[PDB]
Structure formats: structure tokens, C-alpha cells
Amino acid sequence: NLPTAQEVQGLMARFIELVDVGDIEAIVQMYADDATVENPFGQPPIHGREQIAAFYRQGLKVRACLTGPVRASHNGCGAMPFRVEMVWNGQPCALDVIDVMRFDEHGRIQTMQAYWSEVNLSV
Amino acid sequence: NLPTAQEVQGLMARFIELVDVGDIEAIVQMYADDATVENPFGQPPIHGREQIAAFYRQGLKVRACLTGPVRASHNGCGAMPFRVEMVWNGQPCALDVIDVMRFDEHGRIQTMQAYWSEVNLSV
Ligand SMILES: C[C@]12CCc3c(ccc4cc(O)ccc34)[C@@H]1CCC2=O
Ligand SMILES: C[C@]12CCc3c(ccc4cc(O)ccc34)[C@@H]1CCC2=O
């Protein structure tokens, strides 16, 4: 059913772990089949598991970690701060992001909005 | 005009400083006259400076501090992680929150959503 605040904290924490290890198939399965992703917030959203999978395969030697607790509400939504470290054309980079997610009645990610821009990038 | 990503970072950081010192009038002036506030996200929103001022006067010996960088987008929005420490009936408490704000063309807060619940409270 619609995840409780405690369940949202668990789901979002699991999401980061999956991103960290890079299990693309497991990441995609956490999304609803018709989920929408806005990354970064402000740019046109991608829709559906096919587009989401393509996005992650292209994006993910990457490391991800929570940098603070998951903030969860009682209506199936949560927000979390985390950092992503990768390599861009050789040089190591870090990106600080905040994701806001809305889950559906099946415990799957319905909508995801990623807040970040160049000001949160470090090379 | 619509604040740039760098400007959003500055405005949101200033907001926390105002909350920390507790300057109610200065806090209210950062909001648009008809701004809406959802605190915590999930509960009915309050509307207008009068209601917002009443909310802050009731809410603010409180300390507030950013616990990570402000994540800003290019369309006048930002998200930030912070902690609020206060006293509840004698016992000291801490609350971890994430605010998402949308600014208008005048650089004022149009909409604010605060993500938190009992799971983010520490007594
Ligand atoms: C999509 C994402 C936010 C942005 C992002 C991720 C991973 C690799 C990236 C590589 C980039 O060059 C730019 C942005 C990202 C995260 C994976 C989990 C998440 O929330
Ligand atoms: C409104 C707020 C989030 C919640 C909150 C604040 C201040 C005092 C509080 C006292 C409470 O007993 C419960 C919640 C708050 C913050 C002031 C700045 C902000 O974003």
C-alpha cells in the first residue's frame, strides 16, 4: 500500500544503495512502469521504464551516498540529500543533489525530481 | 527578476540565518504577499503573509543551521537540508528538515514545502 513515513525512509535509502553498486535492473524495478523523472529539475522529464533504464545505463565507476537522513511525509513522499562521485573525462568530480520522490500504492517511485545545477558540481 | 541558481543559493541561505536569529518581520518580508506554505508537506497549506507571520510568531529560543549546501535549479527553485533545535516543554529537541522553495520574478518566496515528520524528530 502507500508506504508509511518509516517505509519511505527505507525505500529511499535502498535506492541510493542500488545506485552506489550500480545494479541498473534493480534500480529500474523500483520505478512504476510509467514513472516520470526530472533530472535536473527544470529540464524536460523522461517517461517510462525504457527511457529511465536508458538514462541510468548512460549515467552509471560511480559512487553514491546519503549525506543526511531521509525526510519523509505521511502521504507517500520523501526528500533526501546525497552526493554522487564520478569521473568526467579523467578528472574526478562530485555532485551534491537532493531528490524528492513520490511513491504509489505499490511502493514504487511514481515521480522523481532531482535538484542540482552547476553550482553543486565540484571538479 | 527570476533569481539565478547562484541567487537562489544566497536567498535560501539568508532565510535560514533569519530563522536562526528570529527576526519575524524580516522572515515575512521574504515571502510574496500571497505565498503558500506547506509545513509539514502533506498537511493543509497556509496562505498569505498574515497567516505566515502568525505561524512564525507561534513557532519561533530556536536555532537553525544549514547542514549541507543549497541545491538550486535554473528555474527559480531550490532545496536545502537543515536542522532546527528547540525546547519542547523543557526537554531539548532537534528536527531535520528539507525545504523546497519556488521564487517569483521579484525574488520572493512564492511557495514553500517543508519535508519532515516524527521520524526526523529527536528528543
Ligand atoms: C539520477 C541521479 C541524480 C543525477 C545523477 C546520478 C548519477 C550519475 C550522474 C552523472 C551525471 O553526469 C549527472 C547527473 C547524475 C543520480 C543517480 C540517482 C539520482 O538521483
Ligand atoms: C517552518 C520551518 C520548518 C518547521 C519548523 C521551523 C521552526 C520551528 C518549528 C517548531 C515546531 O514545533 C515544528 C516545526 C518547526 C522552521 C522555520 C523555517 C522552516 O522552514
UniProtKB/Swiss-Prot annotation, chains A, B:
The keyword Phosphoprotein does not apply. Changing residue 121 to A: Slightly reduces activity and reduces protein stability. Induction: By steroids. CDD domains: ketosteroid_isomerase. Changing residue 99 to E: Slightly reduces activity. Reduces activity 10000-fold. Changing residue 31 to S: Reduces activity 4-fold. It is an enzyme of class 5 (isomerase). The keyword Isomerase applies. GO terms for biological process: steroid metabolic process. SUPFAM superfamilies: NTF2-like (SSF54427). InterPro entries: Ketosteroid_isomerase (IPR039256), NTF2-like_dom_sf (IPR032710), SnoaL-like (IPR037401). The active site is at residues 15, 39. Keywords: Isomerase, Lipid metabolism, Steroid metabolism. Substrate binds at residue 99. Changing residue 123 to A: Slightly reduces activity and reduces protein stability. GO terms for molecular function: steroid Delta-isomerase activity. Homodimer. This is Steroid Delta-isomerase. It comes from Pseudomonas putida (Arthrobacter siderocapsulatus).
